[PDB]
Amino acid sequence: LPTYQELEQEINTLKADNDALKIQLKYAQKKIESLQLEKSNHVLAQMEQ
Amino acid sequence: LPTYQELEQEINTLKADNDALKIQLKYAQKKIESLQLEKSNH
């Protein structure tokens, strides 16, 4: 069986994977919005009211 | 302190969350590519 310490290390790895996927997902969603806005000659940063 | 069982539980939850994020990211990447293809045609 894996050691309790190994399980701890695995959790640390999986949390890091989680953090990376979340930031990449936000980045990808912003890119989708940017491409949609490009169709109308606008950029994401100009849309803040 | 977390019991060894509760660590196993947390590992399964994290794997599930990570698998769900990978699916959402893949769909986001497909939409980006689709939009780039549309742009190049337009």
Author numbering:
A (entry chain A): 745 to 793
B (entry chain B): 745 to 786
Sentences from the paper on this structure:
To identify the structural basis for the regulation of RasGRP1, we have determined two crystal structures of RasGRP1. RasGRP1 is maintained in an autoinhibited, dimeric state, which is released by the coordinated binding of diacylglycerol and calcium second messenger molecules.
Residues 747–789 within the C-terminal region are predicted by the COILS webserver to contain a coiled coil and are spanned by the RasGRP1CC construct. We determined the crystal structure of RasGRP1CC at 1.6 Å resolution. Two molecules in the asymmetric unit of the crystal form a parallel, dimeric coiled coil of nearly 10 helical turns that is structurally similar to canonical coiled coil proteins such as GCN4. Leucine and isoleucine residues stabilize the dimer, and a pair of glutamine residues in the core maintains the proper sequence register between the two helices. Two pairs of ionic interactions (Glu 754-Lys 759′ and Glu 782-Lys 783′, where the primes refer to the second subunit in the dimer) further stabilize the dimer. The fact that the C-terminal coiled coil is parallel and dimeric is consistent with an ability to readily connect with the autoinhibited catalytic module and reinforce formation of the C1-mediated dimer. Because coiled coil formation is independent of the C1-mediated interface, RasGRP1 is likely to remain dimeric upon disruption of the C1-mediated dimer by membrane binding. Dimerization in this way is expected to enhance the affinity of RasGRP1 for the membrane by allowing the dimer to engage two Ras molecules simultaneously.
